[PDB]
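Inverse folding, one chain.
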C-alpha cells in the first residue's frame, strides 16, 4: 500500500516533499500536465512584475541559507525559476495526470484520474492551489487600451498590478468599493529601509492583546486625526470593521494590498530606472494615484448603467470601457467522498489550522491559508512540517486527532469569536500562524529560557518566519545560524521594533495612534511624501512607455476627468491644508544596544520602569492558547 500521495505540485508542496525524502517515506506526486498560472504567464512572456512580499518570507529556509545576502523584493521571474528548479529535482516522482475524485475510507483513499488510472494511498495531501477570476486579466492583458475608463468593485493585489499597468497608457481608474486596507510594503526607520513584515514583533501578543492592538491597528483602523494619513484625506478608503468579534489583532479575515511608496521606489530604482522596470519592478503607489487623481474613490452605490456602460459622477456621464468584478479565490478541490459516498463540503473554519478537515481520515490541505503580510513561503513551510509530523509520527497524529473537534472550536473562539464565516477567514497574520504551528510541533522557543536582553530581542522582535523555527531541534536546517546572524547584523537585532513596544506600554489606543503619526515619515500612507515626487513620476511614466515600446500623446487633455477628480478630492482639498516617535525610537535603540548582553534576572529594581516591564517579558501573562494546551 502507497504510504503518501501528494496531489498538486507547484510551490506549496516543495517543503513537505523534501521532508518525506529525508525520512525515506514512500510518496507519489500526481500533478496536472497544464501546470499553474505561472506557466500561463511564462509561456506568453507576461512574467514582467515583482512580488508584494520580501525574499525573507517568500523563499524557503533551505534556499535562504544559500542565497540570502540582503532584504529585497524578488521578481515574478525569480519566483517562477525557483518553482521550476525544484520541479526538476522531483519530476521523476511526479505523475502527469488530473485527479477528478477522492473516495475516503477509514485508513485509505481511492484516487480517480482523467486518464482512468486509479491510486490507493494511506495518506493524501491536496496542494492544488486556488482558481482566480482575475487571472484572465493578467494572463491575457492587452497593453494598447488607452485613454479608456475602468471601474473596479474591489481593491486587491491583482487590481493594483492591473492599475499599475494601465495608468501609464493614460487609462482612468474609478474604485466603486466599500473601502480597502493598503500598506507601504517598505518603510523607513531612522533613514534605513525595512520591508513591513520586519516590524510586526508578533510574540508581544503574549504580554497582552491590548498592547499588541496599539502596536499594529492605528494604520488600519481610523484612530489618528492627523490630516497626513490617507484614511483622513480620502475617507472612502475606510472599511466596515463591525464583523470583527475577536480580541486577537490584527484579526483573521482582514486583507491588505502591499505597494511601493514612491519615495522608497525612488531610493531603490531611480539610478537605473528603465532596466529595473523591464525586470518587473512596477510603480503601484495607490496613495500617489489618489493624490495625483489618476485613480479616484467614489461611493459604493454611485450611478452606473450596465447596458449603456456608463458611470455618472457628480454630473458628467462617463462611458466606462470595462467593469472589473473583484478577485474571489476558491480552492481547486476535486470531489472528496466521505466513506466513498457523501460529498465533502469545504469550509476553512471546519478544518484545523487550515490543514486537517473533519469526517475525512489521513487527508491534509497544504497552501489554502493566506498570510496577511509576507509571502506564502512562511505558511506552507510550517504547514509542510505539521503535515510531515502527522504522516510519519503516529503518536503526534493521535495527540492532534484525539480532540480535533475541540481544538477547532477553541481556535475558532480565539481568532473569529461569534462572527459568521467570511470568504477571507483563510487570511492570518503570519507571525501568529507560524508560532501557532511551532507550539503544536514543539519547535517553538520558551520565553522563560531567555537569559540576556539579546535573547529577549530574538524571542520578541525577530520576525516569526519559518526559518526562525529551524535553528535547532526536530526540523533543523543546516546554515540557519549563519542566516539569523546575517539578518540580526543587518537589522540592529530588531531593537527598533522592541523599543516601539517600550514606548507605548503606558499609552491608550488614541495616544499610540497620535504617537504612530508623530514621525517625519510615519510608516504607512503618509501623504506628505507624495508632492515632491511629481517630477520623478513623469520620468517614471516616460521610462515605462520606453520599456513597453508604447507611445500615447500626453499633449491631448481629457478635460472631463480633470472635472471628476475635483469632486472626489474635496475632503483632501479641505483636510491637507491643516498640515517625537523619531526621538523616542532614537533614544530607545541606543539604550537597548548598550545593554544587549546584560543578564535580565540581574537588571536592578527602582529608562526607569522600562526595566520592570523587560523583566516581566520572562513571564508574559497572555501566553495561553486553548487549541494547543
Ligand atoms: C498573480 C499572483 C501573484 C502572487 N504573488 C505572490 C507574491 O508576491 N508572494 C507570495 O508569497 N505569493 C504570491 N502569490 C501566491 C502564491 O505564490 C501562488 O498562488 C502559488 O502559485 C500557489 O502555490 P500552490 O503550489 O499552492 O499552487 P499552484 O502553483 O497553482 O500549484 C498547484 C498545481 O496543482 C495542479 N493541480 C490542481 N488541481 C489538480 C488536480 N486535481 N490534479 C492534479 N493537479 C492539479 C495545478 O495544475 C498546479 O500545477 C501570487 C499569486 C498570484 C496568482
Ligand atoms: N509595528 C510597526 C509596523 C506595523 C504596524 N502595523 C502594521 C501592520 C502590518 C505590518 C506592519 C505593521 C509600526 O507600528 O509602525
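Residues assigned per position:
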Amino acid at each position: 500500500m502507497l504510504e503518501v500521495c501528494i496531489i498538486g505540485f507547484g510551490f506549496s508542496a516543495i517543503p513537505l516533499v523534501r521532508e518525506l525524502a529525508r525520512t525515506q517515506t514512500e510518496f507519489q506526486i500526481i500533478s496536472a500536465e497544464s501546470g499553474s498560472v505561472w506557466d500561463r504567464l511564462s509561456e506568453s512572456g507576461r512574467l514582467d512584475f515583482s512580488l508584494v512580499s520580501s525574499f525573507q518570507t517568500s523563499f524557503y529556509s533551505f534556499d535562504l541559507v544559500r542565497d540570502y545576502e540582503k532584504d529585497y523584493y524578488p521578481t515574478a521571474k525569480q519566483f517562477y525559476e525557483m518553482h521550476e528548479r525544484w520541479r526538476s529535482v522531483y519530476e521523476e516522482k511526479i505523475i502527469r495526470d488530473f485527479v477528478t475524485k477522492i473516495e475516503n475510507f477509514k485508513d485509505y483513499s481511492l484516487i480517480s484520474t482523467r486518464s482512468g488510472k486509479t491510486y490507493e494511498a494511506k495518506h493524501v495531501v491536496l496542494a492544488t492551489g486556488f482558481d482566480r477570476l482575475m487571472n484572465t486579466f493578467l494572463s491575457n492583458f492587452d497593453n494598447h487600451v488607452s485613454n479608456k475608463t475602468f471601474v473596479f468593485d474591489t481593491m486587491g493585489d491583482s487590481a493594483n498590478l492591473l492599475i499599475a499597468k494601465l495608468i501609464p497608457n493614460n487609462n482612468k481608474i474609478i474604485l466603486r468599493t466599500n473601502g480597502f486596507t493598503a500598506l507601504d510594503q517598505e518603510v523607513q526607520v531612522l533613514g534605513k529601509p525595512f520591508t513591513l513584515d520586519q516590524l510586526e514583533s508578533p510574540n508581544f501578543r503574549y504580554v497582552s492583546s491590548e498592547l499588541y492592538d496599539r502596536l499594529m491597528m492605528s494604520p488600519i483602523y481610523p484612530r489618528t486625526v492627523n490630516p497626513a494619513v490617507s484614511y483622513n484625506q480620502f475617507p472612502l478608503i475606510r472599511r466596515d470593521f463591525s464583523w470583527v468579534d475577536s480580541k486577537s489583532s490584527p484579526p483573521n479575515g482582514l486583507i491588505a494590498i502591499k505597494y511601493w511608496p514612491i519615495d522608497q521606489y525612488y531610493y531603490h530604482f531611480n539610478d537605473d530606472l528603465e532596466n529595473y522596470i523591464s525586470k518587473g519592478y512596477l510603480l503601484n503607489d495607490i496613495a500617489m494615484w489618489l493624490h495625483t487623481g489618476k485613480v479616484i474613490l467614489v461611493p459604493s452605490d454611485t450611478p452606473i448603467n450596465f447596458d449603456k456602460k456608463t458611470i455618472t459622477y457628480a454630473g458628467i456621464e462617463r462611458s466606462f470601457h470595462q467593469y472589473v468584478k473583484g478577485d474571489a479565490e476558491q480552492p481547486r478541490l476535486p470531489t472528496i467522498l466521505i466513506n466513498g459516498e457523501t460529498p465533502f463540503e469545504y469550509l476553512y473554519r471546519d478544518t484545523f489550522m487550515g490543514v486537517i478537515p473533519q469526517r475525512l481520515n489521513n487527508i491534509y490541505f497544504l497552501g489554502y491559508t493566506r498570510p496577511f503580510t509576507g509571502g506564502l513561503a512562511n505558511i506552507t513551510e510550517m504547514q509542510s512540517l505539521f503535515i510531515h509530523k502527522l504522516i510519519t509520527q503516529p503518536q503526534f497524529h493521535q495527540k492532534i486527532h484525539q480532540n480535533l473537534s475541540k481544538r477547532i472550536t477553541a481556535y475558532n473562539q480565539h481568532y473569529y469569536g461569534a462572527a459568521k464565516p467570511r470568504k477571507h477567514d483563510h487570511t492570518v497574520p503570519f507571525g501568529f500562524y507560524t508560532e501557532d504551528i511551532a507550539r503544536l510541533i514543539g519547535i517553538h522557543y520558551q520565553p522563560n529560557e531567555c537569559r540576556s536582553v539579546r535573547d529577549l530581542l530574538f524571542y520578541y522582535a525577530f520576525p516569526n518566519n519559518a526559518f526562525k523555527y529551524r535553528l535547532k531541534g526536530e526540523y533543523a536546517v543546516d546554515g540557519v545560524d549563519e542566516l539569523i546572524q546575517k539578518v540580526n547584523d543587518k537589522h540592529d537585532h530588531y531593537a527598533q521594533v522592541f523599543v516601539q513596544a517600550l514606548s507605548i506600554r503606558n499609552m491608550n489606543s488614541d495616544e499610540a495612534a497620535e504617537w504612530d503619526h508623530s514621525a517625519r515619515r510615519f510608516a504607512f500612507n503618509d501623504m506628505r511624501h507624495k508632492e515632491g515626487y511629481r517630477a520623478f513620476l513623469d520620468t517614471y511614466l516616460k521610462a515605462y512607455r520606453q520599456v513597453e515600446n508604447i507611445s500615447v500623446d500626453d499633449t491631448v487633455v481629457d478635460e472631463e476627468w480633470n472635472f471628476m477628480v475635483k469632486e472626489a478630492c474635496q475632503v483632501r482639498d479641505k483636510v491637507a491644508p491643516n498640515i517625537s516617535k523619531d526621538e523616542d525610537v532614537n533614544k530607545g535603540i541606543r539604550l537597548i544596544l548598550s545593554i544587549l548582553d546584560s543578564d535580565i534576572s540581574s537588571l536592578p529594581d527602582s529608562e526607569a520602569q522600562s526595566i520592570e516591564f523587560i523583566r516581566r517579558l520572562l513571564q508574559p501573562k497572555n501566553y495561553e492558547l486553548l487549541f494547543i494546551r
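The CA atoms of residues 113 and 527 lie 54 Å apart. The pocket of flavin-adenine dinucleotide (ligand 1) is lined by residues 7-13, 30-32, 34-38, 51-53, 58, 98-99, 127-129, 132, 138, 332, 334, 367, 375-377 (CB under 6 Å).
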